[PDB]
Design an enzyme around this catalytic site. Structure first.
Site, mmCIF file in Angstrom:
data_model
loop_
_atom_site.group_PDB
_atom_site.id
_atom_site.type_symbol
_atom_site.label_atom_id
_atom_site.label_comp_id
_atom_site.label_asym_id
_atom_site.label_seq_id
_atom_site.Cartn_x
_atom_site.Cartn_y
_atom_site.Cartn_z
ATOM 1 N N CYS A 1 0.715 -1.077 0.068
ATOM 2 C CA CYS A 1 -0.118 -0.067 -0.141
ATOM 3 C C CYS A 1 0.771 1.222 0.016
ATOM 4 C CB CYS A 1 -0.970 -0.055 1.229
ATOM 5 S SG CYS A 1 -0.015 -0.002 2.797
ATOM 6 N N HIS A 2 1.578 1.458 1.195
ATOM 7 C CA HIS A 2 2.738 2.250 1.043
ATOM 8 C C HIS A 2 3.879 1.891 1.805
ATOM 9 C CE1 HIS A 2 1.398 5.889 -1.487
ATOM 10 N NE2 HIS A 2 0.139 5.655 -0.801
ATOM 11 N N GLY A 3 3.865 0.664 1.817
ATOM 12 C CA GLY A 3 5.241 -0.189 2.593
ATOM 13 C C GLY A 3 5.172 -0.507 4.010
#
Ligand SMILES: CCCCCCCCCCCCCCCCCC(=O)OC[C@H](COP(=O)([O-])OCC(O)COP(=O)([O-])OC[C@@H](COC(=O)CCCCCCCCCCCCCCCCC)OC(=O)CCCCCCCCCCCCCCCCC)OC(=O)CCCCCCCCCCCCCCCCC
Ligand SMILES: CCCCCCCCCCCCCCCCCC(=O)OC[C@H](COP(=O)([O-])OCC(O)COP(=O)([O-])OC[C@@H](COC(=O)CCCCCCCCCCCCCCCCC)OC(=O)CCCCCCCCCCCCCCCCC)OC(=O)CCCCCCCCCCCCCCCCC
Ligand SMILES: CCCCCCCC/C=C\CCCCCCCC(=O)OC[C@H](COP(=O)(O)OCCN)OC(=O)CCCCCCC/C=C\CCCCCCCC
Ligand SMILES: CCCCCCCC/C=C\CCCCCCCC(=O)OC[C@H](COP(=O)(O)OCCN)OC(=O)CCCCCCC/C=C\CCCCCCCC
Ligand code: HEM
Ligand code: HEM
Ligand code: HEM
Ligand code: HEM
Ligand SMILES: COC(=O)N(OC)c1ccccc1COc1ccn(-c2ccc(Cl)cc2)n1
Ligand SMILES: COC(=O)N(OC)c1ccccc1COc1ccn(-c2ccc(Cl)cc2)n1
Ligand code: FES
Lengths: 51, 71, 48, 62, 378, 49, 147, 378
Positions: free
Chosen positions: G111-113
């Site tokens: 998703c963002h890590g």
């Protein structure tokens, strides 16, 4: 504000607060069979209401 | 609320003309263009300065988003 | 639908693990056989 | 002129119609769990030895 | 012996639309009430078509909608009439509420309170229509409602399970969302007849805020021809968005199907919910965030009580006009923030703008009307 | 006797004589809008108290 | 007309089932190799089910309570260390991705890590809770009933 | 200061149900108007359930209905509430029409004419609900309508093809029958509010046929408690037919599925259409038979014009009472003949009884009222 100020406003609200649990506890018994409130059917041992 | 039971009025006269006796388009760019400029000037200092501050926050917010992922 | 009417649920699955009908396919293979999975209609005799 | 027993609790609960507004809720009991005397004891008596919970000890703990 | 004044059915129509006394200086901002009645009728004769060819299940929902754009005849035009017709309803609703806020129309107390009920019912309806096509935005947008709906401390865990069809994502989820979406537009149609019956007791307000009983005109033909012209201009804008760019208001990621397959690159709803999603996302508590969501719409009911000006409207109040347009620019900020990722500049901005939305209505607007009262020597 | 009357005494004696009691009614015309006796008798008991 | 006509319209839209044998009392046999998570849509999400090793509970126990925020481990929730049950729900948003992608056996959210466990444990922000297991008990030889 | 006389919404309810002047000698035959309003509401909150779990196609219709009685929870009770609730509607409708025919209530001209429209709309609705389960009686009963509907000499062949989904028996046949059955019960609900607004101009008729303005009573509490008692007796009869014999009103051959497989042993509809099927079957011409079908229901509109008595009702008319019960015994004969095969004794009987139904209304009833006028010396 002197909007609802007065000793008259809480005098009729003095004699209605005995029957103003007809406002709150009646809502509390008005949501026993309309909702099937699960953990407050064991408020009493009397309601084994669903099988 | 019906038409003859609304309010009390005295000493007022009105004059009117038939629609078939007049032009449907009178002075349109002679009167209309300096009229819509008076209305624009009268409301520009109330409506516009909020939307300028949205523009400055939007530019600062997208530029400081990209100067975080860079290195 | 036979459980509680005339059978308990064991004595019921054993009548389903007695007929062999064709299941769907599986990869690294094709149409295989897997008998009664506790929820199965009664097998027809004729293919058409 | 002694009356009959129809002065039930009329002077006690029923005069000020406080009872009447909330008999769906307050005056609502004595007619679900007190009627275990009703249909289920009658329905299983016409059908004795035919329901599943009659033929039940024959098929557990075997 | 005039039949439109004595027939039992015709005299109801005559008092409502023909012989009704109306103010003569009514502007174009008073056009959007009959436009809302056109958009509601149009969403009914187009939702007829879609529910006819429909199946709502976890296995076939995403394909039941793609069947209509290709295979079902005249289905591409009717589907995008329905998706853009709901964006048209929401722009005609925000203009309508901002009119009555600006000109003090909330002093019609019974008409204003039925309106706040109408704003809740169309907002909950459209939420249960975007969950029906079952894409990525349908899944992850529905599954952030239930995180704040299970946060209700007593009844919430059995509430969400009763509306999810019974367990979780399954076949019967879209039998209770679809049931709560077919029938809610008809409660709106009955709540709109009651809404107009209360307005008929006083007639309309006007832009000056002064009663206009000495200057009334009949509704026919002056505002019957003006409401027909304004409705023709609305059909031009709607058919331009349908026949020239039918995907301008939308998200491409809702064409990627629904599955718990992978986390999406972003999560965002349609444009008319972005102000509300930005407020709850800036509260790090799933109970404080569900309270400020309901407090952002039900705050409209306090507008009759918070009024402290001696005048009714805002036409002669220059200091209050500045605060009204600061509130409009604050809702533009929340619509932009609600489509941004949760990162560094969009948390301090998205949570200060959530504060200023409540500070203007509750504190800044009642004090400024009192200051303007003192400057006019009353 | 007058000096020993207060508000709770008046509430007690009026509830004894008025509340769930059947009245006697007499009327002399034009009395078509005089309400029905069932609607008069039900006006003797109150709704909220 | 208050409890025998309102509250009795109950069983089609509740947790009671038209799927009265769901799949959990269905005879489950392991058609599953270890290292392979199949997308089992059984009560919604893919429930993480495969084989087990003796070496398995040694790598999650090597990182103790000093890492975590809401600590509970394998022996607290699971019956015995030869079985595993999860749900595919992130406790803030609601997804962890496809298997066989992570550091050494997790499911790294792209998703963002952030990263998550194969047994339901918090690793990175910004989600508050841990993954939820469903409730059941142990009864049997191989008769598993997950729920 | 009385709130039920001055509130804008409460004063509509007060004039309609509470303070309404009503005749004091109203009988139990005046109960069936509010019973029809209970049966219509019940068929709406039960048709909700069935259309939720439904698929209407030529391949799955017969199995979509059998899924509900076994698999869908509480589906056996709700399906047979719906099939017997429509038989209850039709018995409360024939009592209602025969009341107004007996007591001369058709002299309320506008109320009577909206009623004839209501009788057509529920008859056409229920025809398009028995075609939905797709059994033998659904097929062969629908395919005798279109033989007389294609007999329309110009537009009929493209009329039936436009409503059959496009060709014949196919998937989309049951998308236009099902569309014409979901939406027709709501035109009935709007036609019933207009039906009562016209009755409110005069009030009710009474069994004597004489105006009763000197003897009115309020509607509450006298007829509010009498309409509640009569509705409780209707729920007892309906739940007895559902919980003790749910297949008594029905045909077993509609459990045999639909296919053009084989000709059935008989063809017959439900009991409330058997009088109409017997009339068209006794005419050996598919245009003369479709004209006498519409002329058996629209003949009610001529009842104000055919009235020749000086009195209004039939309470004091003994010769006219004999003719009214000959008409009821003639409709019992047509209901029996319409479930019989087309053989020797049931063609001469079924076609003489079709003649006598029109001879009583048009010829025998206006002459007999004139004879009774001469016997009373006017
Ligand atoms: C098309 C058709 C659409 C209808 C379909 C269903 C939609 C329902 C609907 O339309 O809602 C309308 C909705 C309620 O309709 P309803 O409950 O179905 O019946 C109408 C009543 O007349 C409404 O009662 P009311 O608003 O006139 O009450 C006035 C007031 C006065 O009442 C009293 O204080 C007691 C006086 C005795 C009342 C006896 C009434 C006669 C019976 O009541 C109170 O103070 C407290 C209410 C008592 C509890 C309410 C339950 C009793 C009903 O009406 C409103 O929304 C009123 C506007 C509220 C704005 C308030 C602004 C001031 C603050
Ligand atoms: C003796 C035999 C009966 C005599 C017939 C006259 C009285 C019956 C009657 O007026 O019903 C009209 C109506 C038929 O009359 P019409 O063709 O509409 O008008 C010509 C007449 O002169 C009637 O014209 P009018 O004098 O009544 O002009 C006012 C007219 C015009 O007023 C309106 O209808 C307003 C339009 C509604 C706008 C809202 C639409 C919502 C969507 O109002 C109506 O016709 C409404 C009555 C029917 C309700 C239908 C409206 C749907 C709700 O009755 C029926 O509904 C069907 C019965 C047709 C056969 C009866 C006459 C042949 C014998
Ligand atoms: C994206 C870009 C967004 C641009 C927003 C700018 C909209 C401009 C609208 C027209 C501006 C305008 O004409 O203002 C002047 C004009 C002056 O009118 P007077 O009555 O003469 O006042 C007296 C002045 N001495 O102001 C007005 O017309 C008043 C506006 C009344 C109608 C408002 C309609 C709604 C507008 C804002 C919508 C957002 C608020 C909605 C809140 C809803 C919350 C759920
Ligand atoms: C069609 C399929 C069948 C439809 C259902 C048939 C229903 C069976 C009807 C049998 C009910 C018999 C009622 C017995 C009561 C009775 O008749 O007593 C006589 C009694 C005498 O009272 P009064 O006339 O007021 O005083 C006069 C003094 N000389 O008469 C009455 O009660 C009046 C009758 C009121 C009519 C109510 C409806 C009657 C049912 C007939 C059905 C006819 C339907 C016609 C409509 C056709 C629509 C297409
Ligand atoms: C489905 C939704 C709605 C419909 C169909 C509708 C319809 C109408 C119509 C036709 C009018 C009269 C014409 C006009 O002034 O525009 C009106 C006026 C009004 N509406 Fe609505 N409306 C809706 C929603 C709302 C909402 C959400 C509010 C407020 C929260 C509201 C409050 C008002 C007020 C106060 C007026 C009177 C304004 C004045 O005369 O100055 N309405 N509405
Ligand atoms: C106030 C009126 C309405 C509003 C605001 C509304 C809103 C919506 C929205 C947002 C969608 C999603 C479209 C998409 O994402 O592609 C939709 C589609 C849909 N609506 Fe409505 N709608 C309304 C009326 C109706 C009516 C009257 C019905 C049923 C008779 C209905 C049933 C459906 C169905 C079944 C879909 C299926 C999804 C699709 O075809 O795209 N809606 N509507
Ligand atoms: C959905 C169908 C119908 C509904 C809901 C309905 C409802 C009502 C109601 C509530 C009344 C007043 C109470 C009563 O007298 O029973 C009434 C009266 C009346 N109805 Fe209907 N009705 C329907 C169908 C019909 C039909 C089919 C006819 C005639 C062909 C008709 C003609 C009349 C007449 C003439 C009256 C006044 C009778 C009198 O006062 O003597 N109605 N209706
Ligand atoms: C005036 C009201 C109504 C009447 C007279 C009526 C009549 C009927 C009839 C005769 C059937 C056939 C049942 C059978 O043969 O087993 C039926 C079933 C059906 N009705 Fe209605 N109905 C009414 C209201 C409704 C409503 C309001 C809806 C939809 C919301 C609806 C939709 C259906 C459907 C889909 C079926 C098929 C399910 C089944 O056959 O069991 N009907 N109705
Ligand atoms: C068109 O649908 C969407 O935009 N939906 O829902 C499928 C979506 C999709 C993705 C993410 C979030 C949402 C929803 O976000 C919000 C935020 C506030 N509301 C709301 C809903 C109802 C009411 Cl009464 C009040 C507020 N909804
Ligand atoms: C419940 O449905 C049946 O009984 N249907 O139709 C499926 C059936 C089934 C088998 C055979 C015949 C029919 C129909 O027979 C008739 C006879 C007259 N109408 C009629 C219909 C509508 C109108 Cl407005 C007026 C008259 N219908
Ligand atoms: S995985 Fe949902 S936020 Fe990191």
């Amino acid at each position: 504000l002197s909007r609802f100020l007065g000793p008259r406003y809480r005098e009729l609200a003095r004699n209605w607060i005995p029957t103003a649990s007809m406002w709150g506890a009646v809502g509390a018994v008005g949501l026993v069979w309309a909702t099937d409130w699960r953990l407050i059917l064991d408020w009493v041992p009397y309601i084994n209401g669903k099988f | 609320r019906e038409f003859g039971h609304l309010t009390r009025m005295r000493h007022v006269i009105t004059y009117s003309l038939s629609p078939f006796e007049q032009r449907a388009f009178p002075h349109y760019f002679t009167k209309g263009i300096p009229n819509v400029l008076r209305r624009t000037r009268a409301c520009i200092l109330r409506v516009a300065p909020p939307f300028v501050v949205f523009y400055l926050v939007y530019t600062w917010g997208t530029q400081e988003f990209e100067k975080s992922k860079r290195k | 639908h036979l459980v509680g009417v005339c059978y308990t649920e064991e004595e019921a699955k054993a009548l389903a693990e007695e007929v062999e009908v064709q299941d769907g396919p599986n990869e690294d293979g094709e149409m295989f056989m897997r008998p009664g999975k506790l929820s199965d209609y009664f097998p027809k005799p004729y293919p058409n | 002129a002694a009356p009959t027993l129809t002065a039930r609790l009329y002077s006690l609960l029923f005069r000020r119609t406080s009872t009447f507004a909330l008999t769906i809720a307050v005056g609502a009991l004595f007619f679900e769990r007190a009627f275990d005397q009703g249909a289920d004891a009658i329905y299983e008596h016409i059908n004795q030895g035919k329901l599943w919970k009659h033929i039940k000890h024959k098929y557990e703990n075997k | 012996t005039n039949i439109r004044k004595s027939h039992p059915l015709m005299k109801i129509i005559n008092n409502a639309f023909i012989d009704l006394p109306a103010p003569s200086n009514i502007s174009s901002w008073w056009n959007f009430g009959s436009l809302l009645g056109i958009c509601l009728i149009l969403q009914i004769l187009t939702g007829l078509f879609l529910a006819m060819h429909y199946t709502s299940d976890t296995t076939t929902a995403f394909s039941s909608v793609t069947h209509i754009c290709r295979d079902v005849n005249y289905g591409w035009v009717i589907r995008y009439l329905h998706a853009n017709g709901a964006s048209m309803f929401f722009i005609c609703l925000f203009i309508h509420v901002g009119r009555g806020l600006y000109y003090g129309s909330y002093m019609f107390l019974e008409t204003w309170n039925i309106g706040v009920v109408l704003l809740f019912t169309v907002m909950a309806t459209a939420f249960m229509g975007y969950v029906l096509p079952w894409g990525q935005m349908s899944f992850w947008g529905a599954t952030v409602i239930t995180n704040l709906l299970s946060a209700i401390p007593y009844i919430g865990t059995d509430l969400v399970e009763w509306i999810w069809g019974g367990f979780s994502v399954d076949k019967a989820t879209l039998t209770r969302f679809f049931a709560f979406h077919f029938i809610l537009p008809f409660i709106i149609t009955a709540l709109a007849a009651v809404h107009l019956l209360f307005l008929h007791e006083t007639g309309s307000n006007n832009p000056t805020g002064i009663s206009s009983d000495m200057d009334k005109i009949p509704f026919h033909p002056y505002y019957t021809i003006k409401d027909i012209l304004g409705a023709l201009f609305m059909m031009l804008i709607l058919l331009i968005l349908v026949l020239f760019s039918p995907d301008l208001l939308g998200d491409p990621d809702n064409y990627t199907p629904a599955n718990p397959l992978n986390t999406p690159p972003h999560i965002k709803p349609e444009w008319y919910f972005l102000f509300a999603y930005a407020i709850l996302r800036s509260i790090p508590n799933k109970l404080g965030g569900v309270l400020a969501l309901v407090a952002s719409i039900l705050i409209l009911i306090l507008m009759p009580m918070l009024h402290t000006s001696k005048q009714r409207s805002m036409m002669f109040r220059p200091l209050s006009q500045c605060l009204f347009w600061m509130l409009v620019a604050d809702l533009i900020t929340l619509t932009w923030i609600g489509g941004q990722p949760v990162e560094h500049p969009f948390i301090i901005i998205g949570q200060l703008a959530s504060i200023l939305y409540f500070l203007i209505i509750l504190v800044l607007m009642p004090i400024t009307s009192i200051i303007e009262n003192n400057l006019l020597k009353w | 006797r007058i000096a020993e009357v207060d508000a709770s005494v008046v509430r007690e004696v009026c509830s004894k004589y008025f509340y769930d009691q059947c009245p006697a009614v007499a009327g002399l015309g034009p009395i078509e809008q005089l309400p029905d006796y069932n609607r008069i008798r039900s006006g003797m008991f109150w709704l909220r108290f | 007309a208050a409890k025998n006509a309102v509250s009795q319209f109950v069983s089609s839209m509740s947790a009671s089932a038209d799927v009265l044998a769901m799949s959990k009392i269905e005879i489950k046999l392991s058609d599953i190799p270890e290292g392979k998570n199949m997308a089992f849509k059984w009560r919604g999400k893919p429930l993480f089910v495969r084989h087990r090793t003796k070496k398995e509970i040694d790598q999650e126990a090597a990182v103790e309570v000093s890492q975590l925020r809401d600590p509970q481990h394998d022996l607290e929730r699971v019956k015995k260390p030869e079985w595993v049950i999860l749900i595919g729900v992130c406790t803030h948003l609601g997804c962890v991705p496809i298997a066989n992608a992570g550091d050494f056996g997790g499911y790294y959210c792209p998703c963002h890590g952030s990263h998550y466990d194969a047994s339901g444990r918090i690793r990175k922000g910004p989600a508050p809770l841990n993954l939820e297991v469903p409730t059941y008990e142990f009864t049997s030889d191989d008769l598993v009933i997950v729920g």
